[PDB]
Design an enzyme around this catalytic site. Structure first.
Site, PDB file in Angstrom:
ATOM      1  N   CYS A  65       0.799  -1.220   0.000  1.00 26.08           N
ATOM      2  CA  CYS A  65       0.000   0.000   0.000  1.00 26.08           C
ATOM      3  C   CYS A  65       0.840   1.283   0.000  1.00 26.08           C
ATOM      4  CB  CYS A  65      -0.896   0.014   1.242  1.00 26.08           C
ATOM      5  SG  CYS A  65      -1.855   1.525   1.435  1.00 26.08           S
ATOM      6  N   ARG A  68       0.142   4.622   2.853  1.00 26.60           N
ATOM      7  CA  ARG A  68       0.319   4.411   4.292  1.00 26.60           C
ATOM      8  C   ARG A  68       0.718   5.627   5.150  1.00 26.60           C
ATOM      9  NH1 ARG A  68       4.329  -0.330   4.768  1.00 26.60           N
ATOM     10  NH2 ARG A  68       4.761  -0.090   2.497  1.00 26.60           N
TER      11      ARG A  68
HETATM   12  C1  HEM Z   1      -6.180   6.545   2.131  1.00 33.64           C
HETATM   13  C2  HEM Z   1      -6.054   6.235   0.811  1.00 33.64           C
HETATM   14  C3  HEM Z   1      -5.390   4.996   0.320  1.00 33.64           C
HETATM   15  C4  HEM Z   1      -4.745   4.902  -0.874  1.00 33.64           C
HETATM   16  C5  HEM Z   1      -4.623   6.036  -1.876  1.00 33.64           C
HETATM   17  C6  HEM Z   1      -4.251   3.574  -1.013  1.00 33.64           C
HETATM   18  C7  HEM Z   1      -3.542   3.131  -2.139  1.00 33.64           C
HETATM   19  C8  HEM Z   1      -3.394   1.775  -2.379  1.00 33.64           C
HETATM   20  C9  HEM Z   1      -3.121   1.209  -3.665  1.00 33.64           C
HETATM   21  C10 HEM Z   1      -2.989   1.989  -4.955  1.00 33.64           C
HETATM   22  C11 HEM Z   1      -3.034  -0.141  -3.531  1.00 33.64           C
HETATM   23  C12 HEM Z   1      -2.743  -1.128  -4.656  1.00 33.64           C
HETATM   24  C13 HEM Z   1      -3.889  -2.127  -4.788  1.00 33.64           C
HETATM   25  C14 HEM Z   1      -4.223  -2.607  -6.182  1.00 33.64           C
HETATM   26  O1  HEM Z   1      -3.390  -2.467  -7.139  1.00 33.64           O
HETATM   27  O2  HEM Z   1      -5.345  -3.178  -6.347  1.00 33.64           O
HETATM   28  C15 HEM Z   1      -3.234  -0.416  -2.142  1.00 33.64           C
HETATM   29  C16 HEM Z   1      -3.162  -1.688  -1.620  1.00 33.64           C
HETATM   30  C17 HEM Z   1      -3.521  -1.920  -0.306  1.00 33.64           C
HETATM   31  N1  HEM Z   1      -3.922  -1.019   0.624  1.00 33.64           N
HETATM   32 FE1  HEM Z   1      -4.029   0.887   0.479  1.00 33.64          FE
HETATM   33  N2  HEM Z   1      -4.585   2.851   0.056  1.00 33.64           N
HETATM   34  C18 HEM Z   1      -5.261   3.644   0.945  1.00 33.64           C
HETATM   35  C19 HEM Z   1      -5.840   3.297   2.173  1.00 33.64           C
HETATM   36  C20 HEM Z   1      -5.774   2.039   2.760  1.00 33.64           C
HETATM   37  C21 HEM Z   1      -6.361   1.663   3.982  1.00 33.64           C
HETATM   38  C22 HEM Z   1      -7.202   2.590   4.825  1.00 33.64           C
HETATM   39  C23 HEM Z   1      -5.988   0.343   4.247  1.00 33.64           C
HETATM   40  C24 HEM Z   1      -6.324  -0.525   5.400  1.00 33.64           C
HETATM   41  C25 HEM Z   1      -6.732  -0.058   6.603  1.00 33.64           C
HETATM   42  C26 HEM Z   1      -5.188  -0.086   3.134  1.00 33.64           C
HETATM   43  C27 HEM Z   1      -4.618  -1.331   3.013  1.00 33.64           C
HETATM   44  C28 HEM Z   1      -4.140  -1.742   1.756  1.00 33.64           C
HETATM   45  C29 HEM Z   1      -3.885  -3.168   1.520  1.00 33.64           C
HETATM   46  C30 HEM Z   1      -4.020  -4.297   2.514  1.00 33.64           C
HETATM   47  C31 HEM Z   1      -3.488  -3.284   0.238  1.00 33.64           C
HETATM   48  C32 HEM Z   1      -3.093  -4.573  -0.461  1.00 33.64           C
HETATM   49  C33 HEM Z   1      -4.331  -5.283  -1.010  1.00 33.64           C
HETATM   50  C34 HEM Z   1      -3.956  -6.563  -1.720  1.00 33.64           C
HETATM   51  O3  HEM Z   1      -2.926  -7.228  -1.456  1.00 33.64           O
HETATM   52  O4  HEM Z   1      -4.753  -6.971  -2.587  1.00 33.64           O
HETATM   53  N3  HEM Z   1      -5.066   0.979   2.281  1.00 33.64           N
HETATM   54  N4  HEM Z   1      -3.435   0.772  -1.445  1.00 33.64           N
END
Ligand code: HEM
Ligand code: HEM
Ligand SMILES: CNCCN(C)c1cc(C#N)cc(CCc2cc(C)cc(N)n2)c1
Ligand SMILES: CNCCN(C)c1cc(C#N)cc(CCc2cc(C)cc(N)n2)c1
Ligand SMILES: C[C@H](O)[C@H](O)[C@H]1CNc2nc(N)[nH]c(=O)c2N1
Ligand SMILES: C[C@H](O)[C@H](O)[C@H]1CNc2nc(N)[nH]c(=O)c2N1
Ligand SMILES: [Cl-]
Ligand SMILES: [Cl-]
Lengths: 362, 362
Positions: A65, A68
């Site tokens: 992510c 973060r």
């Molecule tokens: C606040 C804005 C946020 C942005 C802009 C963001 C951005 C991203 C992006 C671009 C990805 C790539 C996923 C993909 O290609 O499908 C990602 C993955 C991920 N994000 Fe974030 N994220 C945010 C918030 C969060 C939050 C709030 C959480 C958890 C509390 C989180 C947990 C994760 C996790 C676990 C993944 C990996 C998912 C996987 O393995 O399929 N993110 N994030």
């Protein structure tokens, strides 16, 4: 063995969580309490402070992510009290409403009761709370191909999609003790969608593209101190590339690049014209423009990477090891224009964290 | 130990090389000959067939290279006979001429005598045979910053650059027994360069960009059957992104994106406008257009990835394990538009191969 795994994870988590919270002296007594409770009950119950900080640590430790930087401002909703499918449904509707927040998206997680004996209390089938259905029959493809298997499972349960390219899937989840999941149609008033238009190219609206405002991942397991919260949906706001470079662009998703090329007036005939690359840039400009115009939060990959650089700096300054998955952190367009591309990351898994789990359909 | 390493590598290589060449029955006698020769001389000498197929295997095993479909057509020039700096110089000039081939680039490697006791016979200082110099003094930056250290070393040896943004570095190499390397200016008649123009945007020529036709990597070690050919320059043709997305775009290289944005008539003010991404696409279209217009070989990243898919299929069909470095194989623009992005690769090191070695300057 299982009790021992629990206790070991518990000790590691409580120590670290309480250090971070300045609660270091309380560790010894809390661990005793936990030790007794595991001995007697086979498990232990997190305090509200533990649960909240645990979910925040889990986000902080999500290697894939880029978003973060904002880990500490996660809005944690404690729903360990739910016992009925109406309560679960209403909690999910509520998460949509409060996370959406009229377009000013609030990063939120709603935490349901955890697994007991590895026995789930609530099993959510949706990949995201809001997602479009997909259909494939007789060479005929409608909607989001990534949703085909879940759409088929829903249509086994008496639901029927309109077979538009953008049917909203119903919420679908199963309660402990029930053999089949239940499903509920999403109230449209809860679901913000954004029509895709382009800042300069009027024809772009001819594609009749849209996407939903809030990505709410609802099929991952939150693990905190050895407790397995398999049902704990969470959301941020989108990075524009997720929509423009992947959801609407991948051949196995909406596959729109050829149509994009046509409306922006370029030939889609020769690899050397880089028409796919040009189409990707315009589609991605359109996605950002459209979300901004409608007052729905979104971040572009440059700003996102700049924020991630700050996360790296903050981790260092706080004395925490940084972990990351370079292959997911780089954006799918212009990745070498971000600092991420030019450094490496330790892909070690640190807990608390969010993990994949097997799908109950498929 | 060193003799044992040699013999083990020799056995593995000869067995595999001769299997591939249908020479399987000759293995036993060849290995005996080699065994005696190692015992007596401390080393062994490759037959011309071994050297040629070895260099081709090494290319086939280069995990980071997307161009490997064409591994079997490598043109191998055996220069193990050189003994003098004039011979080395003339061999390097010849490599440039024959590899360039009036623009119809021929993938070529010229192999000089190998290390003996880990003692190099010929030590090439250039990173590529053709590359531009770089200067930095008093906040003043000229040319290719990646060439600053080598440029400084050359200017220690009596060479002086004109301090244009595109000074060709001289060939610079050291012979065994000599304390200093020698340098020779490249004859300009040997060096094809391409002015960068854009197919539709006439102003693009105002940037006065150019690049050289042939990338000839001259500082890697070819290892074959335990023999270390530290001096063995090789070339393919460019993939356009190497020039347009990296050499001319990186902030620590020519850093041209802001100027590109200006000549293509877009603002470079807001991340959400994706002006860097748009500028990257136009610059990359210009690079391909310009090389094509001048009759100099080049491949775009889409065609290159399609060729690499064929390499994957060919490896499978021949029963060979495929190895690759996903982080290098994905192109730096629109990587998710290629199949490479959507699969994984085993990054194991298989020999023969090309390896980094320490620079004699720095
Ligand atoms: C606040 C804005 C946020 C942005 C802009 C963001 C951005 C991203 C992006 C671009 C990805 C790539 C996923 C993909 O290609 O499908 C990602 C993955 C991920 N994000 Fe974030 N994220 C945010 C918030 C969060 C939050 C709030 C959480 C958890 C509390 C989180 C947990 C994760 C996790 C676990 C993944 C990996 C998912 C996987 O393995 O399929 N993110 N994030
Ligand atoms: C025929 C056309 C060829 C194309 C289009 C091609 C393409 C590429 C590209 C794009 C890279 C990435 C390097 C970078 O980002 O700087 C690369 C790396 C590499 N290629 Fe090829 N290549 C070709 C021919 C060759 C040949 C003939 C050899 C050797 C005989 C070779 C060996 C390698 C090696 C060793 C690397 C990795 C270099 C490193 O680690 O720095 N390639 N290739
Ligand atoms: C098995 N699950 C696959 C996970 N993948 C590939 C995955 C697919 C899609 C889609 N479409 C979306 C995601 C979510 C990424 C994400 C999560 C959050 C909280 C915010 C954000 N901007 N992006 C993850
Ligand atoms: C320590 N050496 C660094 C290797 N790197 C980063 C490296 C830098 C530059 C540049 N500019 C160029 C390369 C060569 C890539 C290459 C090689 C060949 C034979 C053909 C081709 N199209 N590209 C490699
Ligand atoms: C740190 C990271 O691995 C580094 O930026 C790599 C990434 N991928 C690359 N890929 C290619 N083809 N060339 C490069 O120079 C790099 N740099
Ligand atoms: C096989 C490969 O790791 C796979 O395509 C990954 C690459 N990087 C990614 N990065 C993000 N952000 N999202 C993805 O779905 C993927 N897919
Ligand atoms: Cl998504
Ligand atoms: Cl290069």
């Amino acid at each position: 063995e299982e009790k021992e795994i629990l206790w070991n994870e518990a000790k590691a988590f409580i120590a670290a969580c309480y250090q971070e919270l300045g609660k270091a002296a309380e560790v010894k007594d809390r661990l005793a309490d936990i030790k007794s409770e595991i001995d007697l009950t086979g498990s232990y119950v997190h305090t509200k402070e533990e649960l909240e900080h645990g979910a925040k640590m889990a986000w902080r430790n999500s290697n894939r992510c880029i978003g973060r930087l904002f880990w500490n401002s996660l809005n944690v909703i404690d729903r360990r009290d739910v016992r009925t499918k109406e309560e679960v449904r209403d909690a999910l509707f509520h998460h949509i409403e409060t996370a959406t927040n009229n377009g000013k998206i609030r990063p939120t997680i709603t935490i349901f009761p955890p697994e007991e004996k590895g026995e789930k209390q609530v099993e959510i089938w949706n990949h995201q709370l809001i997602r479009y259905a997909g259909y494939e029959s007789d060479g005929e493809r409608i909607g989001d191909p990534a949703s085909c298997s879940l759409t088929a499972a829903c249509e086994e349960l008496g639901w029927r999609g309109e077979r538009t390219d953008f049917d909203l899937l119903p919420l679908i989840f199963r309660m402990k003790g029930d053999e089949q999941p239940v499903w509920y149609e999403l109230p449209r008033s809860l679901v913000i969608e954004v029509p895709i238009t382009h800042p300069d190219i009027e024809a772009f609206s001819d594609l009749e593209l849209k996407w939903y405002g809030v990505p709410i991942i609802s099929d991952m397991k939150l693990e905190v101190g050895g407790i397995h919260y398999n049902a704990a949906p969470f959301n941020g706001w989108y990075m524009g590339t997720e929509i423009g470079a992947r959801n609407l662009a991948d051949e196995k998703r909406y596959d729109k690049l050829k149509k994009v090329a046509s409306v922006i007036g370029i030939a889609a005939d020769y690899n050397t014209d880089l028409w796919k690359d040009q189409a990707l840039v315009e589609l991605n400009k359109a996605v950002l423009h459209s979300y901004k115009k409608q007052g729905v939060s979104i971040v572009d990959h440059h700003t996102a990477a700049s924020q991630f650089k700050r996360f790296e700096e903050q981790a260092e300054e706080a004395g925490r090891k940084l972990t990351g998955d370079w292959t997911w952190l780089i954006p799918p367009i212009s990745p070498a224009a971000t600092h991420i591309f030019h450094r490496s990351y330790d892909n070690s898994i640190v807990k608390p964290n969010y993990f994949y789990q097997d799908k109950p359909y498929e």
